[PDB]
Design a protein around this ligand. Structure first.
Ligand code: HEM
Ligand code: HEM
Ligand code: HEM
Ligand code: HEM
Ligand code: O
Ligand code: O
Lengths: 146, 141, 146, 141
């Protein structure tokens, strides 16, 4: 995705402060609480019946770390999210059957979690840069759908 | 909200569909899978080849449910209760997909009702499919 | 955009049967009838109080023809819509203030009108190929928005 | 549909927003104009510069209407009727833009309510804003 030196610089410095283990865990649990229909892809994950249950579930936490660890990789390849995410795109279409619309919801919940965690430092312009990156990543992941 | 005229328009275009409701339903599904492939992610267990019995039976179920909403347009939440619990608690289809099927349905009615698909009927049908999508979506969370 | 040779010949074959002026006025008029909010840019066209008044307004019809002649000329450059529409994108954003969402709505109302006009000849594969073309057009027109 | 727990969450979250409601409404618009630049096509008459008094006064009107929405959570349609008529027949903002502002308001709330923006509160806040959006676009057609 095309970001300005200022956006890139925003995105990078902020992510240097993200503990992926914890944010991925919060991102994925809030996704499952806020838009429960996404729980369809995680039936074998435990009790996802209350916010508390979803949040403390270790499998949700372990997955969220995987998901944002992969997401972290794309940030370092912000110039070619397509080739970076092409194998996972195919994975999610052909084996996981994930409606790519979920990648957008996750991207928005992630922006929320970054706002909640960083508060005041997650300013309007910072948000803007992250908004283009999650839209970038979602598209890159929906790219091999057919 | 559906106007009194919207209801008359819908009952006139649907009445017209009559016995083809099922063939239209299957044609709309084929149109959605071909135009909007991500909707296939909801049917990994179906044979989605053209003419497949599964698509034809599903299309028939889709139309009957639409025929039922026409018949009970003045009280859809209650007429569609069951389907809305099914879409909300079991199938859990993301709500964006409903706009894609309602568009494909509209295209299928356009293609088949040249005399009846006037501007105002088009408008009323679009609103109706919107309301049908709302009702099916209303128990999601 | 991404069209196979067969999709290109299906789009261009049906398009050769199109009366650009008639469909143009019809697609714009249906746009203004089915999604009344889009009438917001056309207060100077006059009477848009009924469907019959919209469809029959010579000013909608003349706008319809202009819009669809530009789309029509766009189909000759399916390999480069961004370049074909870049200035129009710029106009629509900085001078006309047209929310790109409206291009998406017109592209779907256009597909409906070709299905009404062509009937059985507007088969699912043909729809699919026009759906890619009207999403490509909607994307190239929104590309210069800032 | 808003559950009594959702109303409780919304009231508690909103109740904490208190007199900052305006400042947050302005921050929410700014986030919106910067993240989704298409929404600026509706305010070609405003100075959308950070700090703009026009965005502040408008943020303030948006916030107060949401304060009235909260105060009338079991009677929104009626409480928001003139705002619904205004966006439907004069402003005519495409429905798609109400979700972009609802996302920006949610982000502004997350950034200012570290302790109160729990997962459950985030979910009831989204629901509430989707319901506000539904009411304001209900008279479009
Ligand atoms: C948008 C950013 C996303 C990224 C980078 C991502 C990345 C990943 C990775 C790396 C894996 C496999 C882990 C491994 O074997 O190494 C995976 C699996 C999976 N993803 Fe995604 N994912 C994303 C979004 C989503 C969304 C939003 C959903 C659905 C709500 C989803 C559903 C799943 C499922 C169901 C699996 C299989 C998990 C299992 O076997 O337990 N993913 N994803
Ligand atoms: C006009 C809106 C819709 C109506 C009236 C409708 C109607 C129905 C009906 C009547 C069934 C029950 C099938 C049975 O009992 O065999 C069903 C199931 C199903 N629907 Fe919907 N539906 C709509 C929207 C959607 C959308 C947008 C999708 C996804 C793209 C979706 C995906 C499903 C799935 C996957 C099934 C289960 C199929 C099976 O495994 O038999 N539906 N729908
Ligand atoms: C395929 C989609 C579209 C194409 C190709 C397109 C093309 C055009 C063209 C070629 C013009 C005239 C440019 C000039 O003055 O030199 C124009 C102007 C205009 N367009 Fe678009 N347009 C499209 C969609 C829309 C939509 C959906 C709307 C809003 C509902 C819209 C609103 C306008 C307005 C208000 C003007 C100015 C007309 C005047 O000043 O009389 N356009 N467009
Ligand atoms: C949470 C949903 C919203 C609320 C509560 C809201 C509320 C309001 C209020 C209270 C007014 C001023 C009414 C008056 O005092 O005359 C207004 C005006 C307006 N709204 Fe909304 N609004 C919402 C969403 C939107 C959206 C998403 C847009 C477009 C992105 C939009 C565009 C405008 C514009 C252009 C004005 C007039 C600005 C001016 O010229 O003064 N509104 N809105
Ligand atoms: O369905
Ligand atoms: O607004």
């Amino acid at each position: 995705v095309h970001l300005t030196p200022e956006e890139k610089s925003a995105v990078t410095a902020l992510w240097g402060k993200v503990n992926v283990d914890e944010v991925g865990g919060e991102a994925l649990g809030r996704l499952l609480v806020v838009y429960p229909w996404t729980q369809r892809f995680f039936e074998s994950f435990g009790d996802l019946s209350t916010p508390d249950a979803v949040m403390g579930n270790p499998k949700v936490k372990a997955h969220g770390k995987k998901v944002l660890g992969a997401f972290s990789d794309g940030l370092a390849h912000l110039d070619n999210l397509k080739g970076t995410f092409a194998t996972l795109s195919e994975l999610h279409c052909d084996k996981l059957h994930v409606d790519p619309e979920n990648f957008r919801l996750l991207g928005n919940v992630l922006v929320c979690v970054l706002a909640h965690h960083f508060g005041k430092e997650f300013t309007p312009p910072v948000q803007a840069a992250y908004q283009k990156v999650v839209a970038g990543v979602a598209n890159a992941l929906a790219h091999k759908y057919h | 909200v559906l106007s009194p005229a919207d209801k008359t328009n819908v009952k006139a275009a649907w009445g017209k569909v009559g016995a083809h409701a099922g063939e239209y339903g299957a044609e709309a599904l084929e149109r959605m899978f071909l135009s909007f492939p991500t909707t296939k992610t909801y049917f990994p267990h179906f044979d989605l080849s053209h003419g497949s019995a599964q698509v034809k039976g599903h299309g028939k179920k889709v139309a009957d449910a639409l025929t039922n909403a026409v018949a009970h347009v003045d009280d859809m939440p209650n007429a569609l209760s069951a389907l809305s619990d099914l879409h909300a608690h079991k199938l859990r289809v993301d709500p964006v997909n409903f706009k894609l099927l309602s568009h494909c349905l509209l295209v299928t009615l356009a293609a088949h009702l040249p005399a009846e698909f006037t501007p105002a009927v088009h408008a009323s049908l679009d609103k109706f499919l919107a309301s049908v999508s709302t009702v099916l979506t209303s128990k999601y969370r």
